[PDB]
Design a protein around this ligand. Structure first.
Ligand SMILES: O=C(O)c1ccc2c(c1)OCO2
Length: 167
């Protein structure tokens, strides 16, 4: 049994809810929250900007030190950093950004990072300002992630379309 409430069960391991990822993290304090990161861990907008704002910029300060030591992530890659006030850990995952011309086949590689964590609160990778089709992102998630994933969707309209169209 876990703390996650109000989710729609899609499969054995994937759950979905219309919720503010920030507000959901603050309520649950999950072991892992996933950030929709870029390779530079520059948390300007979208999910990343919202998560970072909720940490009062501590996520960005920590991320800048990580990049200064390790250099950029790979598209499809990830790193584990602090979850600050939101979670124990933040898994920063880089999905391909279609608005930069990145290979959408890297979306599966991105979701494979979730399999290193038994339970996660996450957004749909490469959705929103990353430019991919969220219906496609949900399909790759279900067909890739084997661990227990609780997906938070920012828009009620998109949430309802994802559920109605789910095979
Ligand atoms: O919370 C936000 O401001 C935000 C902004 C962009 C998003 C999102 C959340 O879900 C995925 O796309």
């Amino acid at each position: 049994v876990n703390s996650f409430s109000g989710y729609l069960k899609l499969t054995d391991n994937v759950y979905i809810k219309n919720a503010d990822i920030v507000e959901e993290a603050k309520k649950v304090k999950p072991t892992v929250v996933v950030n929709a990161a870029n390779v530079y861990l520059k948390h300007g907008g979208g999910v990343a900007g919202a998560l970072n704002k909720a940490t009062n910029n501590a996520m960005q300060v920590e991320s800048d030190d990580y990049i200064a030591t390790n250099g950029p992530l790979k598209v499809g890659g990830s790193c584990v950093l602090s979850g600050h006030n939101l979670a124990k850990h933040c898994l920063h995952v880089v999905g391909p950004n279609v608005n930069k011309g990145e290979d959408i086949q890297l979306l599966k590689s991105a979701y494979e990072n979730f399999n290193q964590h038994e339970v996660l609160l996450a957004p749909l990778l490469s959705a929103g300002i990353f430019g991919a089709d969220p219906i496609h992102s949900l399909r790759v998630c279900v067909d890739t992630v084997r661990t227990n994933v609780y997906l938070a969707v920012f828009d009620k309209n998109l949430y309802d379309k994802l559920v109605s169209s789910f095979l």
